[PDB]
Amino acid sequence: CLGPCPKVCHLLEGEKTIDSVTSAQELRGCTVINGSLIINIRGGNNLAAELEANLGLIEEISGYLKIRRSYALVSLSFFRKLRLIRGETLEIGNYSFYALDNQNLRQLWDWSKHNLTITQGKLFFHYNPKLCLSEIHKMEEVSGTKGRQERNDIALKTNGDQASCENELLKFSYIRTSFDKILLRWEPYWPPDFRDLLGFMLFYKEAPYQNVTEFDGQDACGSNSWTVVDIDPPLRSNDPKSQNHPGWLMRGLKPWTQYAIFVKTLVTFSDERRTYGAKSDIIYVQTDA
Amino acid sequence: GEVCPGMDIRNNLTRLHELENCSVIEGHLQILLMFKTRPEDFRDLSFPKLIMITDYLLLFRVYGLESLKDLFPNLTVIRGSRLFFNYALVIFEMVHLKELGLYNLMNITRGSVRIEKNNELCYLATIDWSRILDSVEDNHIVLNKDECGDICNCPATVFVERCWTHSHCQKVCPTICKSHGCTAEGLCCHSECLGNCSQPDDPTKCVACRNFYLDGRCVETCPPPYYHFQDWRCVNFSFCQDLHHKYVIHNNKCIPECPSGYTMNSLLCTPCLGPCPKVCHLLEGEKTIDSVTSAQELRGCTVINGSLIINIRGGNNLAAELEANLGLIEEISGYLKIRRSYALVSLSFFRKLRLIRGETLEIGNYSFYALDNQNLRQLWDWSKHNLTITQGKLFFHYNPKLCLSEIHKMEEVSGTKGRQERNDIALKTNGDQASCENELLKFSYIRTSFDKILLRWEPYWPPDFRDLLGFMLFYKEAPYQNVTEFDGQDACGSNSWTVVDIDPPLRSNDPKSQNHPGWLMRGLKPWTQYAIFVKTLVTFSDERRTYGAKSDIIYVQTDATN
Amino acid sequence: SLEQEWAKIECEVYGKCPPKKAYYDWFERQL
């Protein structure tokens, strides 16, 4: 046409539940959804390919968008060009975007590329174990909800249980080795407010090979395989050039056995933009003969 | 005189205006960090009523002060029960002090002297600590000015003359007056006396005594019913009892707390009288346990006179410490709530909790409350344990790994079902992640092809066949027969269970149910080994027994074609 | 020894100084 003429697809009573391929295919080519969309994908089988072939042309949702109990869906990016959630109808609680119990959701849209404005309504995020807080906070800024001070119900404890989002990187400056004790010292790390550092937490696991990953064990997939040695915060110096490198002497090791080790910061929430925490890479130390 | 507690005054003359009419102090006196103080301030300050300090005396950075002979002149003896790191006299960083001046110091019962980094101090070598302290080996007197030229009639001991100031000698009396005191003429005081007395051979004229003081005449030991207190006075039973009520009797001495292995019985410290009950009272009827320290606060609290909240967080299991501390609680007078227990897999650390009285209840009239416990897998072992609830409802929500079987057994043990409590137990938020099918399905007949596997299993029907919604066949690649059972999350390996819903067969023929259900899988690959099991899909209800059946995993293989 | 090196470190970083310096620790804590 000359002038826009999108394929508006009208939903029964303003809601449509997408559970399988057939439910998604019913919205194939529906560039505008004149209702609310519920995604409830079930089963350990990922349908992201079929969801993008069918839902990936939707660019507007006139109602709310809810993703609840989506197991195999690791990403909402199958909404390949969803740019607007008008929120004319809202999920109870005045929510325009809703995300609950999504067990393997790792990311939303790629906010480095994608845009998604919300005309009205709040954001909701609960019990998304893999989805990081940073992924959600970027949505609050892109969606304009933060730009209109929406009291988004996004519980910090319930999301990003398994994920790790430490922008800062800790580097070990001292690795002395004995047959049963290793002395480590990492760089000094401090949040903007030094009191937000409640402490460090060392994580050392004896490794047969140098292939251990921090996400392994931390995630529910693998049982946790690290020694969570929590460490008190260091007595801070006024002079930044006199901040001694904190460290720990982990005890009771085995002779010439290789340990996989990393250290992480325990930083309390500071509201708004978090002061953020730091984490070291996995380092391998062979102790001594 | 009067009785005054321990005071810590720093840079506060107004706070100081309190020792003008007091004689003894049952603590420590710390005058330090005084920089505004000036000689003019001190020249008109004197406290001759103070006699003995119990714990210790500490002096630090007191400007303007040059001599202590006029501030505290009548100090004679120091007990030294509570020592400041094994020290009874602390003299540190005195930039304006010239001499000690304490010309009335006689003996030190317990403790040492600490003199370090004190400039401009003199008259240090003229003090005989041997006649004052029993063991001068722990004395630390270094880093001082003492050429001073101490000019003292004064006695001379091992020979150097002993004196405190230029006009006051050191009181050194013969051996016979070793500890009983001594007057100016050279006669010892009463056998119970100490330091100095006004009249020789008189126990009612001594201001300082080694033994306990009682009614002027110092006594060797406190006669009943006077209990020892602080090792210097003999207070009555009603005296230290009032101090306890805004102190417990033990070995003829009302001490603040009983030693290890004793407790107050309603004062006397005794451990078991008849049945032994410990009642721990909670602030405003609630106490939250989140860490080892919060649990240890309830160690041995057999009876909790309040409500208990468990909020343990983090992945580190504290069940061992929780059982060492909470595992002796046998009654909770309030409600019991468990919330956000990420790591706690079992409440069995309440090793002998038998009753939840529910006198106070969680809002909603709940006596037991369980919410958001991520890894709670079981409650108490109801095969062994008992736990009655006197009143109040049960609450269970969002306990993903706690199967409803454990919850329903609690409803029957706790008596809530026995009084028809409308327990708020969310049937599909507790134990959803855990399959609790207790009956078994066996694959009666297996047949395989290069692309397909035909399976049949034994027929199954709940007590009411209408409660059977169907079956669920789970199949997955299994190159190794190590596939762990389906635990509500498939497996950690990238391969995931393929769920196939199967509507139930036709109820037909004999009550033998001669209709073996079956399914034909078709999307399979040759050479490939597959793990398969079948689960039932059954309508749950207050029939309370339609738990369903589940097969063991079988590792069928397909045929191999070119 | 390695423990001795950390003994010093504990005092240096965490303020866990020997019992002989516990007395000095109080003065640092004061004010």
Author numbering:
A (entry chain B): 304 to 592
B (entry chain C): 5 to 150, 154 to 159, 168 to 173, 178 to 265, 277 to 296, 299 to 594
C (entry chain A): 1 to 31
Paper passage:
We show, using single-particle cryo-electron microscopy (“cryoEM”), that IM459 cross-links hIR domain L1 to hIR domain FnIII-1′ and, in so doing, releases constraints on the membrane-proximal hIR domain pairs [FnIII-2]-[FnIII-3] and [FnIII-2′]-[FnIII-3′]. The resultant three-dimensional (3D) map displayed pseudo-C2 symmetry, refinement with imposed C2 symmetry led to maps with ill-defined receptor domains. We thus undertook focussed refinement, masking the region corresponding to domains L1, CR, L2, FnIII-1, L2 and FnIII-1′—this process resulted in a map of ca 5.0 Å resolution (with detail in Methods, Supplementary Fig. 3 and Supplementary Table 1). The map was then interpretable as comprising (i) the four-domain [L2-(FnIII-1)]2 module of the receptor, (ii) an L1-CR module, adjacent to domain L2 and with domain L1 in proximity to domain FnIII-1′, and (iii) a considerably more mobile [L1-CR]′ module on the opposite side of the two-fold axis. Two tube-like density features were then visible, sandwiched between the juxtaposed surfaces of domains L1 and FnIII-1′. Attempts to improve the resolution of this focus-refined structure failed, likely due to flexibility in the linker between two components of the peptide and the resultant slight mobility of domain L1 with respect to domain FnIII-1′. The relative disorder of the [L1-CR]′ module and domain FnIII-1 with respect to the remainder of the structure may reflect individual IM459 peptides being unable to cross-link domains L1 and FnIII-1′ and domains L1′ and FnIII-1 simultaneously; alternatively, IM459 peptides may be able to simultaneously cross-link domain L1 to domain FnIII-1′ and domain L1′ to domain FnIII-1 but, in so doing, destabilize the central [L2-(FnIII-1)]2 module. The relative conformation of the focus-refined hIR-Aecto domains reflects that of the insulin-bound receptor, in that the L1-CR module is displaced away from its apo-interaction with domain FnIII-2′ and directed instead towards the receptor “head”. The relative positioning of domains L1 and FnIII-1′ is, however, distinct from that seen in the site 1 to site 2 cross-linked halves of the three-insulin-bound structures of hIR reported recently.
